[PDB]
Amino acid sequence: GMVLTLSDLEKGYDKNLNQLSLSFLNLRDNDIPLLCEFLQNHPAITSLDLSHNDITANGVKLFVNKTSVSSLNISHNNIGPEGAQWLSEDNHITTLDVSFNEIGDEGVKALAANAKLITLYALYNKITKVGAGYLAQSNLKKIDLCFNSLEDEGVIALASNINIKELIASACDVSDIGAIELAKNNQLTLLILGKNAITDKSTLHFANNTSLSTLHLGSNQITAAGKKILETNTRITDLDLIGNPIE
Amino acid sequence: MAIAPQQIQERLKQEQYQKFVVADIGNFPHCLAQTPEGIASGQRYQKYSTNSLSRTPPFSQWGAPQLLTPKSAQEYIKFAQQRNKKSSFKIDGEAVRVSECSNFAYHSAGVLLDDPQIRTQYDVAVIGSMHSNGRYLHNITLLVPKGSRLPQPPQQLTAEVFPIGTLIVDPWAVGMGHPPEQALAIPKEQFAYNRSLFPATVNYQSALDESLTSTRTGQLTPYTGTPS
């Protein structure tokens, strides 16, 4: 287009990793056709980083089903709900980062209906308990939802999703109510719930959890008593409690 | 003697924020930047996390969120002073300084407020950014050119009332691996977290701080020296 250059493309082209990185270049929708042309000329590139640019939903329309890119980072753009809706139509993407795009509950509604998706990063997207409800019906194995006000109702819905193996939901307005239901879940192997309102009340349920091997509960309200309880679970090889009022 | 934004940036670069232990990497793993500095910060956290000294003071509390925003200039300068002081805790022979997404901006505020030239050219502000359902998840330090005021809570700071010439200072972003050009004394257009900047709440304004004039400058020493 008017911004993306051939020089950008070749400097961003990591030939050892077959990865194209074009972050922080102020790319716009009009730059997407040139991008796709380059990717079509180099079909081995299946991982793409377009993060921190100025792409909108129109740029997504110009990208989707053009290439064999299966891993896409388009975080920190402006693709919105419609951009997310469109991405949900892509037939190659299995790992997707749409963090910081204001995709909202409507955006996530479409993505959650895409059975192709295995991993979704969607930090800070104004996703609410309604969006979490949509994701609870998805086939996602991993979801990162940090900085979304999911609330207890949200993560309670997510806890019922038998497919999710890894859930990241820090700073999501989760209390003991939500955390306890996540603790009862028997499929999660990694759970991160930092920066929420979780107390010692949840810790017995995490001590009796049998699925988790990673549990991050940093910067909550857990005390030394909760820590003592959590440490009885020896299945958890990565336990993070940094920032809690311990001792 | 007017100080240039680059000279302000170089001053902040001397603090080596990318060398900090970023304690909430455990909370927000996906906020690690795709950079050599991000890779190093992730490794530094892992070592810190598995080191028993991390659970001893003042390191343990340094990792804990400080929700109450300081209302005196001196507290900020003291924040930076205490964070930089030598300690016995070393990771691979390296001094350990710890912060997180809520208190990290306080350090830079202290550094900036401690320069006599900054205080004549700029008002210093600390804001809560990354708004989510009534909460502001990310604290940022602002350098506002003198004579422009900022909205007081519960009024929000928005792009429309963001003073021209405002510089953003986000050392947490640097701790996470973003280069200075995306986080230290730069216009919002270059800011790594520009997409979550507004709306914001302004929790501290040096222009509204009556203790400022009695607060002294030149208390701090740059954590490192500039290379040639």
Domain segments of chain A as ranges: 1-247
Nearest to A76 among B23, B55, B195 (CB): B195
Report CA-CA distances (Å) from A188 to A47, A211, B33: 26, 6, 26
Q: Reading across the β-sheet that carries A71-73, which strands appear in turn? A: A13-14, A19-21, A47-49, A71-73, A95-97, A119-121, A142-144, A166-168, A190-192, A214-216, A238-240
Phi, psi of B221 (to 5 degrees): -110, 135
Strands across the sheet containing B184-186: B184-186, B167-169, B135-145, B122-132, B201-205
A218 to B23: CB separation less than 8 angstroms, yes or no: yes
The dihedral formed by the CA atoms of A73, A77, A78 and A79, expressed in degrees to the nearest 10: -20
Q: How far, in Å, CA of A79 to CA of A175, rounded?
A: 31
Tokens 């309880």 label which residue?
A: A229
CB contact under 8 A, B26 and A123: no
Chain B residues within 8 A of A246 when measuring between CB atoms:
55, 60
Torsion angle of the four alpha carbons A188, A190, A195, A201, in this order, in degrees rounded to the nearest 10:
50
> Min CA distance, B137 vs chain A (Å)?
7
Residues in Cβ contact with B190 at an 8 Å cutoff, skipping those fewer than 6 apart: B181, B182
Residue B172 is part of which domain span? 2-228
Q: How many CA atoms does the CB half-sphere of A44 hold within 13 Å?
A: 6
B223 touches chain A (CB under 8 A): no
The distance from CA B145 to its chain's CA centroid, rounded to whole angstroms, is: 18
CB A143 within 8 Å of CB A165: no
**Contact, B183 vs B174, CB < 8 A?**
yes
Neighbouring CB atoms inside 10 A of A135's CB total: 25
A216 neighbors A191 (Cβ within 8 angstroms): yes
Q: Which residues pair with B135 in a beta bridge?
A: B132
Asked if A117 and A96 count as a contact pair (C-beta separation under 8 A), the reply is yes
Residues on chain A bordering chain B, Cβ-to-Cβ distance under 8 angstroms: 21, 23-24, 49, 51-52, 76-78, 97, 99-101, 121, 123-124, 126, 128, 144, 146-149, 168, 170-171, 173, 192, 194-195, 216, 218-219, 240, 242-247
A98 with A125: CB under 8 angstroms? yes
Q: Residue A21 is which amino acid?
A: S
Rounded Cα gap, residues A63 and A157, in angstroms: 32
Cβ-based contacts of A192 with chain B (< 8 Å): 26-27, 29
Q: Closest Cα to residue B7, out of B184, B191, B227?
A: B184
Residue among A52, A147, A219 whose CB faces B132 most closely: A147
Kind and range of the H or E run holding A203 = helix A203-207
* DSSP at B221: -
Q: Hey, is B143 helix, strand or coil?
A: strand
Q: How many contacts, defined by CB atoms under 8 Å, are there between A and B?
A: 100
Interface check B196 vs A, CB under 8 A: yes
- The terminus-to-terminus CA distance of chain A in angstroms comes to 58
Distance from CA of A42 to the nearest CA of B (A): 23
A-chain residue closest to B133, CA distance: A149
In order of A46, B71, B108, B169, the CA distances from B12 in angstroms are: 38, 22, 7, 9
Domain count, chain B: 1
The amino acid at B99: S
Give the number of other Cβ atoms within 10 Å of residue B160's Cβ.
6
Q: Please, which experimental method was used?
A: X-ray
Q: How many angstroms separate the CA atoms of B207 and A170, rounded?
A: 34
Residue A21 pairs with which residues in a beta bridge? A49
Q: What is the DSSP string of B40-103?
A: HHHHHHHHHHT-GGGGSTTHHHHTS---S---SHHHHHHHHHHHHS--S-BSSS-B--EE-TTT
User: Are residues A181 and A161 in contact, defined by beta-carbon separation less than 8 angstroms?
Assistant: no
> Rounded CA gap, B35 and B55, in Å?
28
The first and second tokens of residue A112, run together, are 């959650």
DSSP-derived pairing of the beta strands B98-99 and B122-132 = unpaired
In chain B, what residues touch A147 (CB-CB under 8 Å)?
A: 130, 132, 137, 196
Under an 8 A CB cutoff, do A100 and B195 touch? yes
The answer to whether the CB atoms of B64 and A243 lie below 8 A apart is yes
Q: Which of A24, A97, A219 sits opposite B27 (nearest CB)?
A: A219
Measured CA to CA, the distance from residue B188 to residue B166 in angstroms comes to 8
Amino acid identity at B156: Q
Resolution (A): 2.0
- Cβ atoms of A35 and A58 within 8 Å: the answer is no
Q: What is the DSSP letter of B215?
A: S
